[PDB]
Structure formats: C-alpha cells, structure tokens
Structure 1
Amino acid sequence: IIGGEFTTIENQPWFAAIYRRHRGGSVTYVCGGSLMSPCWVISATHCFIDYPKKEDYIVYLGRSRLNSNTQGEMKFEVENLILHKDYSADTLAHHNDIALLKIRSKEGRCAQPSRTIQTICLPSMYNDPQFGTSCEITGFGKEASTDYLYPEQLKMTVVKLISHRECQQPHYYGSEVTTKMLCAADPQWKTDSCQGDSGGPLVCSLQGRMTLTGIVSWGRGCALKDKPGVYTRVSHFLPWIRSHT
C-alpha cells in the first residue's frame, strides 16, 4: 500500500495472510485474502494460477506482522483450493479473479472467533455502494513501486470508488475494465494498493455492514494519476461463491 497508516490485525480481523513453502527452509508471502466463514477464505486466482499445489500454501489468521509471530495468530493448511474456471489475464487485466481456499488446522478445525479473527460480510447479489463511497484496503504490499521488499507491519488506507464511466475513459483503462470489476482511487492519486496487495479486501459500508466489496486484483503502476487500482466486483460472483460455499 502506498501511503496509508501502519495498523494491527484488530483493525482488520478478517484479513488472511497466505504464504508458500519452499522446503529449501523458507516460506514467502504470496497474497492477502479475507475470511468469509469459519472454513473459507477468498482471494484472487492469479495468486495461485502458477503454482496450484495446495499442499505448499499456509494460511495465517490474526497476523499483524509479515515474518514475525503475532500473539493469537492461527495457522491452517489449504484443504481445497478453488480457482475460477474462466480466469484469464491479458496485458493488465485479470478476468474472473476470485479464488476460495477451504482451511483446516492441524487439529482439524476451521477458524475460531477472537478479538483478532472475525469474518467480513458479503454483499447481496449485484448490490454495490455508489461511486464516491470511501472504502478501505489492507495488506503487506509494497510501499513504493521501486521497493523490492514488503513491509513487516500491516498497512491500510482509504480510497474512493469511482464509476465505470470514469475508469473506462481511454486515458485511464478503456475497455480493459469490465462490469465484473470496480475501480477505486484517491482523489489526489496519493495512496493506492500495489504489488503484494493482491487478493486482499476492499471493505465498504453497505446497508449498515462492513462488506467485502472488492478483491485487490491489478493496476498500472501504483498511485499513478488516472491509473486507479482495479478490484474483482464481489457482488457479481455471489452465485459462484455460493456454488462452493
């Protein structure tokens, strides 16, 4: 996240950190995700597409730091990894970029609620906030496009939803953005999501609930003028989600 503030998991208790193991001894961070129900986490298919080996991923809940432990964190293995049939990537956009990870702990249980672990609400079918709404994004992604390391402390920032008409303007993304995507940016192009933030949540208040409105998907550069961040529009995948959850 470019800009934003450093935060703790108590402020985003539904945030999930997904890592990959290389038996060489190291575990590296892959993407963020969000807990939907006790046993299911939602993220982005493009985070797994290249190495769809579920046995090499570890999911942690209740984590405020990237490589150090947080008291109260929970570790799970991925029991099922459901990627979107029809996921497609082009020169920028990822289409149908949503994935579901079913989690199980070594004791065979799903997540349990605590002051650092909570589910986030899903929207109702095709129901979104109106453009202008300020939503927040969280993650361990880069703080500057030139960085080659990720922060150790979780960050968050507030961004506003913009209309498709504005995002599909030729000097923004044109038709690369579809109705199954949402664009969000800072009025002054000062904060944004960036590499390392993929799969995490775009949370907005909808009908009184803090709802998972989008999943961090792609963007040209980070915090660039006229280059909003693009998110998978969760309201449009509710049947898919239900088909599996």
Structure 2
Amino acid sequence: IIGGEFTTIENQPWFAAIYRRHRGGSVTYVCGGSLISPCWVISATHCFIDYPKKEDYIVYLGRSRLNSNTQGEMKFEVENLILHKDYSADTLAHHNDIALLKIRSKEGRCAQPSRTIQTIALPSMYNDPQFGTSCEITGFGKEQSTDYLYPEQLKMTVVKLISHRECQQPHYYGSEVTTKMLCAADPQWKTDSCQGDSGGPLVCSLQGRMTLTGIVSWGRGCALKDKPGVYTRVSHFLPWIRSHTK
C-alpha cells in the first residue's frame, strides 16, 4: 500500500496471504485475498494465471507479517483453485479478474474464526456504495511502485470511490474501465494500492456492515495523477461466486 498506515490482521481479519512454493524449496508471496466464508478465500485471477496449479499455493489467515509468524495464524492448502473462465488481460486492464480458492488444513479443517480470523460479507446483487464513499484497501503490496521489496508488515489505507462516469474520462483510463470494474482513489493522488496488493479487499460500509465491495485488480503505476486504482466489482459476480461456492 502506497501511503496509508501499518495495521495488524485484527483490523482486517478476513485478509488472506497467498504464497507460491518454488521448486528449490523457496516460497514467495503471490497475492492477497479475502475470506468470504469459512472454506472460501476470494482473490483475483491474474495472481494465478501463469501458474494455475492449486498444489503450488498456500493460504495463511490471521497473518500480520509477510515472512515471520503471527500468533493466531492458520496455514492452508488449496483444495480448489477456481479462476474465472472469461478472464482476459490487455495492455492494462484485466477483466473478470476474480479468483476463488477453497481452503483446507492438512488436518481437513476450514477457517475457524478468532481474534485474528473472521469472514467478510459479500454485497447484495448490484448493491455498491455511491461515488465519493470512503473505503479500505489492505495488503503487503509495495509502499512505492519503484521498490524491490514488500513490507514485512500488513498495510491499509483509505480511498474514495470514483464514478464510472469520472473513471472513464480519457483523462483517466477512459475506455478500458467496464461496468464490472470499480474505480477508487485518493482525492490528493498520494495513497493507493500497488503491486502485490492484488487480490485484496476494497471494503466499504454497506447496510451498517463491512462489505467486500472490490478486489484489487489493476492501475497505472501506484498512486499517480490522474490514474485511480481499479478493482473487480464484487456485486456483479455473485452468480459466479454463489455458483462456484455452491
């Protein structure tokens, strides 16, 4: 996360840390996620598109640190790695950029809620907040685009939603933002998600309840005028979510 504060997993207990096993024993971080139900993490498909083998991946819940162990964390195998079928990526945009990982401990158990692990609510069909509403992004993505390292500590920040009418100005991203996407950024252009925050939750207050309003998807750069963060619009994918978690 560019700008914003350091948080811990207790402020974003639904957050999920997805890593990939590499063949010389090494294990790097891949992307973030959100736990939408006990057995189900929801992330973004581009995180997995080059390496689509579920057996490569590990999910951690209740994890505030990127490469050291948080007291509370549970480690998971990926039983199912569902990527969206009609996913496609162009110069910038990524479309239908939404993944689902069913999780299971080597012991068989799913996510058991705790001080540091909780589920997050999905919105109603086509039920987002209005433009200009403040929302929370979270992850281990870079503190500045140009770095070559991720933060060891989990970060969060706040951003305002940007109407599609405003997002689609050629000034911004123009054509490339569909109605299945969602634009959020800071007024001042100084805080945003960045690389490696992908798959992570854009969370807005909806019906007096924290709701997964987006998945971190793409942007040009990290936090630069006048290019907002773009997020997969969760409300428009509930049939796909409900059908594949069925």
* TM-score of Structure 1 vs Structure 2, range by shorter chain: over 0.9
Count of residue correspondences: 245
Distance in structure 1 (CA, Å) of the matches to 2:150 and 2:68: 13
Tell me the secondary structure at the aligned position of residue 239 of structure 1. helix
Distance in structure 2 (CA, Å) of the matches to 1:205 and 1:236: 18
Distance in structure 2 (CA, Å) of the matches to 1:199 and 1:79: 18
Q: Which string of whole-angstrom CA distances, capped at 9 and with x for unpartnered residues, describes residues 120-179 of structure 1? A: 100000000001110000000000111010000000000000100110000100110000
Q: Which string of whole-angstrom CA distances, capped at 9 and with x for unpartnered residues, describes residues 44-102 of structure 1? A: 00000100011010000000000000011000000000000000000000000001000
Distance in structure 2 (CA, Å) of the matches to 1:106 and 1:154: 26
Tell me the secondary structure at the aligned position of residue 223 of structure 2. strand
Distance in structure 2 (CA, Å) of the matches to 1:76 and 1:199: 17
CA-atom RMSD, angstroms? 0.5
Distance in structure 2 (CA, Å) of the matches to 1:57 and 1:228: 30
Given the two structures, how large is their TM-score scaled by the length of structure 2?
0.99
Distance in structure 1 (CA, Å) of the matches to 2:177 and 2:111: 35
Distance in structure 2 (CA, Å) of the matches to 1:168 and 1:23: 42
Q: Quote the offset at 1:200 in angstroms.
A: 0.2
Distance in structure 2 (CA, Å) of the matches to 1:109 and 1:40: 12
Distance in structure 1 (CA, Å) of the matches to 2:27 and 2:73: 16
Tell me the secondary structure at the aligned position of residue 219 of structure 2. strand
- Look up the match of 2:180: 180
> Any gaps of 5 or more consecutive residues in structure 1?
none
Given the two structures, how large is their TM-score scaled by the length of structure 1?
0.99
Q: Quote the offset at 1:43 in angstroms.
A: 0.2
- Look up the match of 1:130: 130
Distance in structure 1 (CA, Å) of the matches to 2:81 and 2:146: 32
Tell me the secondary structure at the aligned position of residue 199 of structure 2. coil
Listed as ranges, the matches of 1:80-99 within 5 Å are 80-99=80-99
Tell me the secondary structure at the aligned position of residue 195 of structure 2. coil
Tell me the secondary structure at the aligned position of residue 118 of structure 2. coil
Distance in structure 2 (CA, Å) of the matches to 1:66 and 1:168: 35
Distance in structure 2 (CA, Å) of the matches to 1:149 and 1:95: 27
Q: Quote the offset at 1:22 in angstroms.
A: 1.0
Q: Which string of whole-angstrom CA distances, capped at 9 and with x for unpartnered residues, describes residues 192-226 of structure 1? A: 00001000000001111100000000000111011
Tell me the secondary structure at the aligned position of residue 24 of structure 1. coil
Distance in structure 2 (CA, Å) of the matches to 1:27 and 1:18: 10
- Look up the match of 1:151: 151
- Look up the match of 2:103: 103
Tell me the secondary structure at the aligned position of residue 145 of structure 1. coil
Distance in structure 1 (CA, Å) of the matches to 2:221 and 2:101: 28
Q: Quote the offset at 1:15 in angstroms.
A: 0.1
> Any gaps of 5 or more consecutive residues in structure 2?
none
Q: Quote the offset at 1:31 in angstroms.
A: 0.1
Q: Quote the offset at 1:26 in angstroms.
A: 1.2
Which of structure 1's runs of 4+ aligned residues deviate more than 2 A?
none
- Look up the match of 2:142: 142
Q: Which string of whole-angstrom CA distances, capped at 9 and with x for unpartnered residues, describes residues 14-33 of structure 1? A: 00000001131211000000
Q: Quote the offset at 1:244 in angstroms.
A: 1.1
Q: Quote the offset at 1:187 in angstroms.
A: 0.4
